[model samples]
Target: STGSATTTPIDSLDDAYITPVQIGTPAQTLNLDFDTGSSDLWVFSSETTASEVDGQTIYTPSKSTTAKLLSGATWSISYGDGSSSSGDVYTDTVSVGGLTVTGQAVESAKKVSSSFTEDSTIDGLLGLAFSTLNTVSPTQQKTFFDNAKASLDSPVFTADLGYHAPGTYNFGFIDTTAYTGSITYTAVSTKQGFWEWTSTGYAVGSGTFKSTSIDGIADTGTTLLYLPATVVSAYWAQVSGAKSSSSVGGYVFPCSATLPSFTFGVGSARIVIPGDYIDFGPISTGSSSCFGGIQSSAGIGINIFGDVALKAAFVVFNGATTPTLGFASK
Candidate 1:
């Protein structure tokens, strides 16, 4: 006999936008964004002024059958991109799909900007990716996973990258049968709020830069991969037939040649980035050129390995149990 299966369409909002996800039933659902960048669950409230509450979805506690505030505890966060918001913290009943969980802590931002406020389509972010990079503290505050663990039969969550839409996101119970082999586990650093790791070094094609090792954070929230100047320069030097053109930012090679492969070494785990990813040209940047690699800050105390890297495999953020990250084959 076969069982009936159902799936929810994961929604995507423009960058810096927030949405609403019904937490409980229709009467109790709250807006949320499932953020992979940071691990914090919050919402907007009545106290937030209209001007400050831009691009954010507001949920009325009166509308929710289950809601509770954290009294005086409020929070405000500013991102590296010059975006900021402030709001109060509270515990409330939150629900998603058929799952209903209570006592979930959330933030209600009062002040938001038009750049962030105008794009309010979804409720809020449901950060199911990883807790190592969480903005909230499990010791002092509660997360969506912390609250939902009790109700979930399996108590495991899996991200189905293909389920939502091509390049879209989905989350929920892990289907062990759907995957094969053991998940690759990585130790997370406790010092910084980002999920950071140390790279033994980086190699571009035949040439290898042995002296320079890169340390930065990995994040699914970002779209592009940011590399340091040394790594970028060494990489562009090896393209067989490629030539450095004024139009191409880093290195512009002819499409005919085989693009060299770049590999990053982290402890015993070796992550090899494909040649196709190295080619960022054809963007029509006036010179029929493409950007080979982006030049960003390095050793800047914080960096992120965004979605471009996460696409290599299946990533699981285990917050319900102990703080752990699970990686497996897609």
Candidate 2:
């Protein structure tokens, strides 16, 4: 079977994207962030603490005839940004796009950090990472894709992120019309339970390509692109007033600076990110300084090809025994 879903950018700055999901019998609809960087299909639910439940939709397990508590199953997940959520688990009928998975493990959030509560648009997160990264205890659970792959026409999924427009997440088959060129496929390591791969090198604007291989993950959950220090410095140096800011955190430059495009190679193919995408927007409301999307991944340990880079291409996550990633410019 094949399915497609729409992912809409949450804010004007394209801070994050969310997809409408259906959970339980009779289907309770909620908007969820499809995060390829984490594994745990968790939700804001009726069981969550009252204060933590802002304007976000809550999935009431009691209303679903198909919902059943998973005895002794509990989960907790924390991100590098310090955002976290945790709660007990339940088995329910979960549906995304047109694909449905019966007995899907749904983690109900009993507690969520202020960051999640502040983002009223998202009701929960639907993790698309490998099931090995699932946090559920007593018995780890399979992700929606893992459970549905057997019945799908193909064991694969695709992400088409947009700059300021709505994008798509497709399951089972690739949409040929979504991209303009032939996809360049590369082997991905699941050692860290991520869609991790290596890029041939990068170029600053019309500059020559540097022949350095950089390892990174295609993370749709993250907002910006992070690369090695030297690569990041090279790009920023071209901007008129760009500088690494200690007070602002990361690199910032004049809002009016003429930003340059960034290019990275996937084998012989090159994916170029537009200049506008690199300007993350003003550091604060009406500020003269704007934060650059491309930053140094020094402390991060590994490069991160986040939305800033992913939005420039059509990405495929092949869920074969040995996984592979594909990229094509849109």
Candidate 3:
């Protein structure tokens, strides 16, 4: 039977959303972050050194009859922000929502950076990116979605990210009720094993939309939107007290300042991001200073439309010979 899952956003959509997943025999259940940015299902497990694990549930492979060790095989992953994790490999039966995949490669994180140890909201990460990016050694690993694709009615998934509310992630099909108007699809060129696409250009406030191909990845694991240095500078100019803070390492402004919505083009359709949403969060949460949700992509050649930007609309990730991204107003 075919099925789909609708995930709920956590931390008011400031961070990431989690999906219920069962791993191993007897099915060890865990709430995992559904990350479209990376490929590798990693978890804090009994294998993790005690000092590296805190406030998170650990998966016990020894307790599961179905868990098989992929001997001599290891995996290591590092993110754009320097967040990293390394683990050994285990082939287990993992189920997402109700979609089950046997012989799935599950990386049991034995070592994790300080970034993951402090984030207790996620017990593990369920990677949705292409299988090519998987960090497994000796042999590459396939993601949960890839393994389940053959059984799915369609090779697609829809992400409905709610703002400070509940949202859904539908696999195999799209829910018309989750979005409004018509969905606009754009060509996706995934050369780097990411859902990479180009926005024709962007406009600040109600100004004119320009034609500039800004290449970027749609990353659910990232919190803010990152663009080129010049583009970020132009957008921040519209807000009072908005400036690049060396200390904060991003654009910051007075928490109460009024700002205009930012707009980006998806082929012919324009997706508008509300001004208030650009405020992101406070640097200290005292209403004194706040960080801008849009910032320079830094040295990275590609920009990132993270959760801050993705939540503005309903996005569909279509995995075909040549993938495409579909967007619509939510």
- Cα-based lDDT for every prediction: 0.53, 0.94, 0.85
Output the lDDT of residue 34, model 1.
54
- If the candidates were sorted by their TM-score against the true structure, best first, what order would they fall in? 2, 3, 1
Q: Stretches of candidate 1 above 4 Å error?
A: 1-20, 24-32, 44-48, 52-57, 127-140, 149-173, 176-182, 199-214, 236-295, 319-323
Candidate 2 Cα misplacement greater than 4 A, ranges: none
lDDT of 3: 0.85
* Top TM-score prediction, candidate number: 2
Better by TM-score, candidate 2 or 1: 2
Off by over 4 Å in 3: none
Worst 10 residues of 2 by lDDT: 73-82
126-172: candidate 2 lDDT, tens digit per residue: 99899999999979999999999998899999999999999999999
TM-score of model number 2: 0.99
lDDT tens readout by residue for model 3, 1-330: 345665666575366777778999898988788888999999999999899887888889999999999988899999888999998999999987677899999999989999889988788898988899999998999998888888888888877777776677777887888788999999887789999899889999988887799889888878789999988899988887788889988889888888888888888888899887787677875668887888899886779998878889999999876789998987
Model 3 clashing residue pairs (backbone): none
Model with the higher lDDT, candidate 2 or 3:
2
What's each prediction's TM-score? 0.67, 0.99, 0.96
Clash count (model 1, backbone only): 33
Worst 10 residues of 1 by lDDT: 1-10
